[PDB]
Design a protein around this ligand. Sequence first.
Ligand code: HEC
Ligand code: HEC
Ligand code: HEC
Ligand code: HEC
Ligand SMILES: COc1c(O)c(C)c(C/C=C(\C)CC/C=C(\C)CC/C=C(/C)CC/C=C(\C)CC/C=C(\C)CCC=C(C)C)c(O)c1OC
Ligand SMILES: CCCCCCCCCCCO[C@@H]1O[C@H](CO)[C@@H](O[C@H]2O[C@H](CO)[C@@H](O)[C@H](O)[C@H]2O)[C@H](O)[C@H]1O
Ligand SMILES: CCCCCCCC1=C(O)C(=O)c2scnc2C1=O
Ligand SMILES: CCCCCCCC1=C(O)C(=O)c2scnc2C1=O
Lengths: 385, 110, 55, 93, 74, 62, 246, 62
Amino acid sequence: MAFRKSNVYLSLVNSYIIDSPQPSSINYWWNMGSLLGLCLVIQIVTGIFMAMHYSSNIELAFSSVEHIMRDVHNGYILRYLHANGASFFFMVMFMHMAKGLYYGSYRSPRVTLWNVGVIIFTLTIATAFLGYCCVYGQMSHWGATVITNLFSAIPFVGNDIVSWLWGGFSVSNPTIQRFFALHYLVPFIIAAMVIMHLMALHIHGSSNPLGITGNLDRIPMHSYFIFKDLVTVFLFMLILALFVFYSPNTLGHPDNYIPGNPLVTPASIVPEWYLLPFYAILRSIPDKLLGVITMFAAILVLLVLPFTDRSVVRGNTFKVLSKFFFFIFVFNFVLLGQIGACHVEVPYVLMGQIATFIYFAYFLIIVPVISTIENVLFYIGRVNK
Amino acid sequence: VTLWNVGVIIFTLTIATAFLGYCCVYGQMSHWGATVITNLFSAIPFVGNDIVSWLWGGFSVSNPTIQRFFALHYLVPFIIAAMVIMHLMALHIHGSSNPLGITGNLDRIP
Amino acid sequence: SSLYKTFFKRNAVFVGTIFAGAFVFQTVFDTAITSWYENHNKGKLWKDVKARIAA
Amino acid sequence: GPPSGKTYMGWWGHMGGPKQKGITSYAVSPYAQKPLQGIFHNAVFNSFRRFKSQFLYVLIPAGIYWYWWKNGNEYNEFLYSKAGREELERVNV
Amino acid sequence: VTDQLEDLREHFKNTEEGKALVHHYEECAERVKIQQQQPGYADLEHKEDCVEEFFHLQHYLDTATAPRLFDKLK
Amino acid sequence: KVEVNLAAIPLGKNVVVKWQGKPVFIRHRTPHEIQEANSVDMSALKDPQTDADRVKDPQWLI
Amino acid sequence: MTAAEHGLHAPAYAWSHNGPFETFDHASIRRGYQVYREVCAACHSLDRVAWRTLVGVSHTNEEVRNMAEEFEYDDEPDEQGNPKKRPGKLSDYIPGPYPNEQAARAANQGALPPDLSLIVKARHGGCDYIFSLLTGYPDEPPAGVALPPGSNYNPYFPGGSIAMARVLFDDMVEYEDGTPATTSQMAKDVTTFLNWCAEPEHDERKRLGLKTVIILSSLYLLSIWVKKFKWAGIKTRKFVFNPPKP
Amino acid sequence: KSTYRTPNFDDVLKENNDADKGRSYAYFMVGAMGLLSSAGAKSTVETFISSMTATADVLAMA
Ligand code: HEC
Ligand code: HEC
Ligand code: HEC
Ligand code: HEC
Ligand SMILES: COc1c(O)c(C)c(C/C=C(\C)CC/C=C(\C)CC/C=C(/C)CC/C=C(\C)CC/C=C(\C)CCC=C(C)C)c(O)c1OC
Ligand SMILES: CCCCCCCCCCCO[C@@H]1O[C@H](CO)[C@@H](O[C@H]2O[C@H](CO)[C@@H](O)[C@H](O)[C@H]2O)[C@H](O)[C@H]1O
Ligand SMILES: CCCCCCCC1=C(O)C(=O)c2scnc2C1=O
Ligand SMILES: CCCCCCCC1=C(O)C(=O)c2scnc2C1=O
């Protein structure tokens, strides 16, 4: 047989990238996965090169980043690429996730595929946050303070886990140095998790926009999808280029250009845009313990979808009620984000509380109810007795 | 053969890893070792001394050197891990050999 | 397009010719850009300011 | 190698679909086709169609959320201006 | 010479729109000093200021002077 | 162990000092503030405490 | 939140460096440096800027060398161990007016004039904000505002009460290039110089950007064409069904 | 229908007066893509590598 088939190493590449049978009808929404691998590489590469010039000590961290910005040849390109890359990493991840939601990609027999993806999402949030703390700006310090304190909510030992995590009395030199060590480690765990994601994808293959079987008409990954992936890879790079060279700080916060100060918290704190929806959910619960539990639940609830989707067909392509509600969910998520950027003031607090309700209700009430109703409608519209 | 060749690559990567770690202590031996091993590249004709000043990130073994060495010491072990997986993949296709040097296909145990 | 068939004759362009062209492009393009750029900002640059200075 | 678990996808020659018969496909080499330029005049009015059927599912939920946002915002602005400092003390605490 | 920004501000404080705005601010300033001279101003927890009215004025000025101030500078 | 010179702090002003890396607030309260503090009912507090249980000298909130 | 708390929104001035294809105005940077030295340096440090970075940007190699030598820095101890001073060299960083944070507060009613090296990137509004703050001090605060002793009113600053008084007044600087030193002209200059301090890579970054965007745009368009060609056989593919007899 | 009667492809087929028309365009496209891609790769590689060279703050002439 061909060498690409017989060689122990090449056959892996052949089965995953060259001869892999793809459903002839997949659309550009299926291009986000490769875009996610690309993002992972860009983050690792630019990160290692900057690590060569970075100092983790609390007295030097901020200045070492400035050193990367002012003295390292092409240093600012590395930092703006790494920083803006993290944002682009989340924009693409949400689209990857939303695509799965809309087409019922989370359904059997791809449950394992969906669950591993949830784990990756969590690991990515943890990674970006740790990286954020390495700049040691004003936002960095308080973020490191808030997130680590999240654990004090645990009864009895909670405050202990916290002083442990800090390695002292407060967010200090033992904190930022362990955060750097950890920021370097986690990306390699994501890589291993990405491999398990791909292994799970390979056993049943990709789904398609029609939601039905692809077994009757497949075309090779090689040529068709390699070249189609190239189209979005270049588009992705063009847009990232525009931010990196023309508007490098639009997705950041001015407060991070101010060194961290243990005694003063900024008058207006607005977290990273991709964390805003979660920040709003946290803020909407006037109880400490319940506040953190509901926030974590906002992520874990994604695990419930394979069971609450009562439909008999996969995906929202041929479903009027489901498409409509799908978009209520999308814009509700954006709203939550907008609320997160506002002050805890009158019309906003109640709006935040209702939006949070709607978010959870989609998974637990709307989907099961709507899918059941749609099942029946499909039946009585054709049976004549 | 493939099993043996991947093993040679691992050996090289391990030597490189331990050496970089050695330089992180920055003791007397560390500094001179970092100096000698990086200079090993000046032996290359024409560009050799350039590769060296590049590797150092300056006039001599200094602050840009040790910091890049630490970054590198952390990275390489994960490449060894991936290489160890390829080593195992190559081992799995034909299995282990045995002290008699002949086939094991007539009597195996789990 | 017969303009293509004169240089490559019904065959695709080979790596060598691609790499060679890439090295040429890199230099020509960079000069074209640096030129247009400096001309667009004439009067604002240090070159321009250095002339208006005498010390 | 070790026995593998049953899946819903095979490989070329045993993909797992039902036995096909009666269907006949035809195709023409991309090399013999009109160079990419005919995607107009014939493929222009046909386009944009796959969004005239969808925009409602996107527009209505968008509209609903935009007005809700605009309403609450304008209310906030009023509450913190001079004119609304009275109502602010009412709804605040 | 005279400051280019102050020149443009002055020019705009004298338009129909600017006069209307200085008036509203003026009417506020007036209403305020009268409240201060009366007994018990120190203890009132409802002391009015004219910041809001001042901001409207300043905003109008900014809107008019911002796209023109640099054409006059070097 | 940190020493703060109270004689230096003005009337209704807030001063902040470092103690074990943690910020220490110190306000020289006005007579009106002292009344506001000690005139609040426990039913209005989720964590019930009299101003007395919190300050030793009503003039200094620490 | 009340307008007084947020602060008056800074309007959009037409900076010559705004725009994808625009470089800083180096003459303005030069002037700005003078305004910084003669006015601001009295209370503001510029810790992250090194003398050498001025060469070829706003001053000649010679000019910067003369400027750096007017200041003293700690040199390496002598043959016997006693400390000794030394004039400045290009490798050094522009020195600040105060030896420590405590002395900085003592000289400013207890306030701390922040370092201006990143000020333009460390505030929403950027250049528009800095300029507006500097030229926005009214002779008298609006009616009703109880301004604390030692403070000043400025509408652009959050809360209105700022610890920095107006420091720019007409003709307080004698511009070496002849330009009329009006308060707005000076504000316009320092701000430009402060923008350069925070983003020294500015001019170069935008040049590289133009190259990057042209190549990627071209690559993007080209890929579409290639993809369509490679897909034409599948796209125009046609099927026919002929029900098999039993 | 008879399988020998090939369906209509007139709308897609190019009136072959210039046989090597689509080939010349496709090959030019692929070629230009390869040209610009190699230039980009070269620039990217050079950007990372030169970031390891001596920094601006260490080139002091003693
Ligand atoms: C000492 C007498 C000063 C001179 C001369 C100048 N500044 Fe200043 N500045 C000073 C103080 C005491 C403060 C603190 C203000 C506060 O309330 O915290 C400042 C602050 C600034 C700021 C930051 C303002 C902010 O948004 O937080 C800026 C942007 C600033 N100063 C700029 C500036 C410039 C450019 C000057 C010369 C033209 C200048 N200052 C002079 C004290 C003094
Ligand atoms: C050591 C290798 C390294 C890896 C691997 C790495 N980073 Fe980083 N990252 C850094 C360093 C060094 C910094 C500090 C410099 C900086 O601010 O960019 C940083 C900073 C960050 C920041 C702060 C950006 C800012 O505003 O300055 C974020 C966010 C981030 N990383 C995200 C990621 C993500 C997401 C990944 C991977 C999926 C990743 N990083 C992988 C080294 C790495
Ligand atoms: C919460 C879910 C989730 C996350 C996060 C996730 N994936 Fe996926 N991924 C899926 C699902 C489900 C599919 C199956 C899509 C289908 O066939 O409908 C999938 C499919 C893929 C594919 C196939 C092509 C495609 O886009 O459909 C690739 C490649 C892939 N994912 C890569 C990644 C990478 C890389 C990451 C992130 C580092 C990631 N995924 C994170 C859910 C996820
Ligand atoms: C230069 C050679 C070489 C190096 C170095 C090497 N291996 Fe091997 N390895 C072999 C060969 C050859 C075999 C086959 C042994 C046999 O069956 O006779 C083997 C077999 C193995 C086995 C099977 C059990 C055994 O010991 O025979 C394991 C497990 C293994 N290697 C792990 C590793 C790991 C882990 C490393 C280092 C990080 C490593 N090897 C490095 C040559 C190497
Ligand atoms: C079934 O459906 C599929 C499908 O299966 C696939 C695979 C794809 C294609 C996409 C992919 C395969 C994405 C895969 C991505 C990955 C495997 C990424 C793995 C990630 C990594 C980060 C690798 C780790 C890298 C390193 C350790 C090295 C980097 C560091 C270096 C080189 C330092 C060098 C140092 C010096 C001093 C020079 C599809 O598009 C698709 O659609 C239908
Ligand atoms: C990641 C870094 C990117 C580096 C650059 C990207 C790769 C560029 C590869 C460029 C050229 O590689 C070149 O491709 C063309 C196909 O288009 C090959 O052509 C081959 O296939 C074509 C097409 O059927 C035939 O006409 C031709 O006779 C044959 O030799 C050519 O032999 C090879 O040399
Ligand atoms: C899934 C985890 C979501 C993270 C929520 C924490 C968001 C969050 C806060 O709640 C906060 O108070 C501060 S202060 C500086 N940064 C932050 C921040 O990111
Ligand atoms: C395979 C690589 C073998 C490494 C040989 C270099 C050994 C070696 C030297 O030659 C030397 O002069 C010094 S000085 C301090 N340490 C060393 C050292 O390890």
